[PDB]
Design a protein around this nucleic acid. Sequence first.
DNA 1: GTTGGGATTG
DNA 2: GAATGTGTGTCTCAATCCCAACTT
DNA 3: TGACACACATTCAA
Length: 542
Amino acid sequence: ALPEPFYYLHNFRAVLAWIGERYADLLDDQERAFIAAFAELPEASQALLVRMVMRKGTLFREGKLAYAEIGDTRAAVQPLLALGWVDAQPTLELAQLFGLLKKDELSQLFRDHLGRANLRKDALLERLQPLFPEARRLAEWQADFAEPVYELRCMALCDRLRLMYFGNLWQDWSEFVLADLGIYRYESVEFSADSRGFRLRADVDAYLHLFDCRQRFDLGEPLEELLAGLPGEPYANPWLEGRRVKLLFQFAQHCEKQRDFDLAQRLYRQSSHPGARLRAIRSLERGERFAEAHALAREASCAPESDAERQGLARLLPRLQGKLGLPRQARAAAPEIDRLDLCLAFPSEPCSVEWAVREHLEEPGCAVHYVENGLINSLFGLLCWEAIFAAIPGAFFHPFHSAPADLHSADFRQRRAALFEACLGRLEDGSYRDAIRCRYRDKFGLQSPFVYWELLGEELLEQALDCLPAAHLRAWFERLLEDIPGNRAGLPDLIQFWPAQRRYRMVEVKGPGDRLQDNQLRWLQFCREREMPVAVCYVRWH
DNA sequence: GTTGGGATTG
DNA sequence: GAATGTGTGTCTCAATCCCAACTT
DNA sequence: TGACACACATTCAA
Ligand SMILES: [Ca+2]
Ligand SMILES: [Ca+2]
């Protein structure tokens, strides 16, 4: 509904300029030649090229290329044919033709070799691939097919550019029009004109290779040839080693699901990924090598990766000490968790077990809310908003940031320690209550990692602000900062407020067929050692 | 005719 | 009865087409 | 496009 018909080409020329000035030193010979050559195309053909780069395929029937802004599809496509950037009569493997053509058209083309039953499209290919392994020009499948198919052949450079400008490959160019329409509305940070996503080109190239390995894997191919291509020595850049170490982790998971534990051990062991060490032990155990398992677990319990790894090691060590001759480690006492049982009539009809306990528990002198990590994450997101989106160098390179780029980075707290000391300071004097309504009214709806506007109504915001102790908020917000990925979930299903007694209690509801998860248990027990009001409500039916 | 999942699209 | 492995649904931007599968 | 929580199945060491 915005004016201009060509906005998407304005936006693409826009990103070409931005990579021209910000990434100038990072471009190559072949690449900088592309940005130059692109600017010389007619407006009609530059527009078509942006359409194909923005749609799903690398392959298109001329028929699917109808656009009003560009009059003729065939006319606009010639200057692109000249650079070899768009192929006509490209080569299509059997499977790819099944994408381009309807089942009607495919039925006739292979009309000979389908006699058996009329059957599905996914099924045809299964029975039709052994007959047609080879790939052919579109002309060599049916010689008279008069509709071109186009293959955009320069797409690799475009993803390299998209990756450099955005700094993660999941965001589309559609980020532009959505922001303009006011659909996804982002916070605007003012960062330096020299700040950018990637420093070295070898950083871009490495990200791109890891992305290639999961692409080739989520299709597959064996890892046996993939781990040939991955580096066997850690990456220079920390964020890359983050990405690589995670990739290794997920490959090892796929191994474990195929019951290949001897390889699973080798893979987990060379990933630094969270809980990788644990899956390594549990993998060795699954593969019946108990001797190595026990030694790894003993090594881990000495300086454990996390409270969650402590929590799992507290199960693995004694079982291993069981299948080995060793004396068991008597596990710890737990403070216990405040039990509440409810016998409720049947659904009918569902209506989750959680919602039902919310209506049951409301006194009405009691108010009860369904918020899962919504309320603590959100209050934190509001209070520390000015610290989170603080303009720290290399934390923002574009307009579309939903969270700082350094968010999971280990020293992220330390770099902002100023504004965090200030925002966390508002708990010590009274100023947090007003400050949170201030960031809340001003910043409502803006995309942020922690703030669930959907969840946070006026009633819940001010009920929580006056029933939640300043000091308990200090505790939870400090714990949240200790491991951002590892502590932002586990929180309970419900929180209830008694505003007259300015009390609250958080309640986890477990229907039959759920137990308390490990991270949930950490959250409950952390509160319970701090003498915070949490409780677990287990429901039975009758 | 209906679903229902996808792409596409501003 | 724990403790595991493993499968499923919910978020969605919303509106519109275009197909493939099912149901009449 | 995952991250989360839940639901259900399987396999064990008390
Ligand atoms: Ca829940
Ligand atoms: Ca629950």
